Amino acid sequence: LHVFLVSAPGQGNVTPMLRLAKSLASKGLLVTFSTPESYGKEMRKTNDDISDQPILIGEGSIRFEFLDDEWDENLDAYATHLERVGKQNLPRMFKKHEEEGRPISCIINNPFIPWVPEVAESLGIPSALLWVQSCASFSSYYHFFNDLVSFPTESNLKKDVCLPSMPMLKYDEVPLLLYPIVPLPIISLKNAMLRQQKNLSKTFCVLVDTFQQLEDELIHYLSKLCPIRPIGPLFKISDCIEWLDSKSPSSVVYISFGSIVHLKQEQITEIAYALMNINISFLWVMKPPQHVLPQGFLEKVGEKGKVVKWSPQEQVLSHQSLACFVTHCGWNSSMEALANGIRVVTLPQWGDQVTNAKFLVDVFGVGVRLSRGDLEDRIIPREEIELRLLEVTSGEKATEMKHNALRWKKAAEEAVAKDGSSSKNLQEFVDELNNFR
Ligand SMILES: O=c1cc(-c2ccc(O)c(O)c2)oc2cc(O)cc(O)c12
């Protein structure tokens, strides 16, 4: 088999599609991953395993055949141009593979190049979709595009939303890209999402980065409208740690916010005071673009605290020292917290991070809510942060959320085990690819 994995620019898009690539390669498939060269060569220069040629995994390999971007530096501006070059170029690359005994059986794309199922359609090549957010978020988008349930509008900005097989969200707990008020540099992601929901008809399979028991009933309901397959999580399918060793177990407050979120300086300074004040141990990831910490922060907290510029998150998350996780609640981060058994402290910023935060707190039951997101735009005072740090590590539910945590970590490892739901959804989808052939 030979499947073509096409992904939009961005760390958050490429990583999961790569992980879907290392997985299909593990199953005797040859995968060719591609992404715009402008950001592609940036992966080249910044990654150790570049591409001299295929890179075997199990009995399959992963080739690299980047799309010529035709874009040297000169968001909506680039999206339209990229769509232009992609349709220009992608048949030319598929046509090359046609004459070298490599007819492509399937294409895989993510929502932020939603036009890809159109080239798949014209060229006769079946189209599938890698969805990188939860299944509650997919349902948010699908119901909204087809307008099957009512959302906030300009005339009612605080309307609740009642999605089937979901807890009733609130106006600011629906994925922020469906809100009718959106920054004009971001409207282009709203349009990409919505365009992908228009192209769903042409698509025979949606591969979702979640597993069957995390969103059990939801996946059953939407599976009648939609061809949804849970195959996750993908990260588990396929000096920092020396320091945490010295600490006692379940003791270190962990603090990341992914590699895009940039908090506000006032929010930084309320957290540093919070940590100082309750005097907890911590590992706070402070990625550079320059945030300042209070005068004598480092000396005051001592060896109880530690600030770093980057962290092996998956590793760190698998540590017993960790007491909790202050997170921006991206999908992969919510799932890495779930699968590893760690309680969370939710600081949603934008997008679907406000839905996942509603889920971590009130559904999966694995922690405490610190903020409600950009639409709240309320600098959270250190007093409250200190309260949630107490609530999640010492307080009356602290062990019940620990319990709930260690049970979603059980179910995650069963989903990915040999004859588990997530793994047999993979092999089946691979089994479907042959039956076309
Ligand atoms: O809605 C999205 C919003 C943003 C974003 C939001 C606020 C910012 O101040 C910023 O610099 C980026 O970044 C994204 C980045 C993504 O990969 C996907 C998204 O939906 C978004």
From TrEMBL:
UniProt entry keywords in alphabetical sequence: Glycosyltransferase, Transferase
Signal peptide range: none
Residues annotated as binding UDP-alpha-D-glucose: Q133, W310, S311, W331, N332, S333, E336, D352, Q353
Enzyme Commission (EC) number: 2.4.1.-
Pfam families listed in its UniProt record: UDPGT (PF00201)
Residue stretches spanning the membrane: none
UniProt entry tagged with the keyword Transferase: yes
InterPro entries per UniProt: UDP_glucos_trans (IPR002213), UDP_glycos_trans_CS (IPR035595)
CDD domains: GT1_Gtf-like (cd03784)
Source domain of life: Eukaryota
Molecular function via GO: quercetin 3-O-glucosyltransferase activity; quercetin 7-O-glucosyltransferase activity
PROSITE patterns: UDPGT (PS00375)
Gene3D superfamilies in the record: Glycogen Phosphorylase B
PANTHER family, A to Z: GLUCOSYL/GLUCURONOSYL TRANSFERASES, UDP-GLYCOSYLTRANSFERASE 84A1
Protein name: Glycosyltransferase
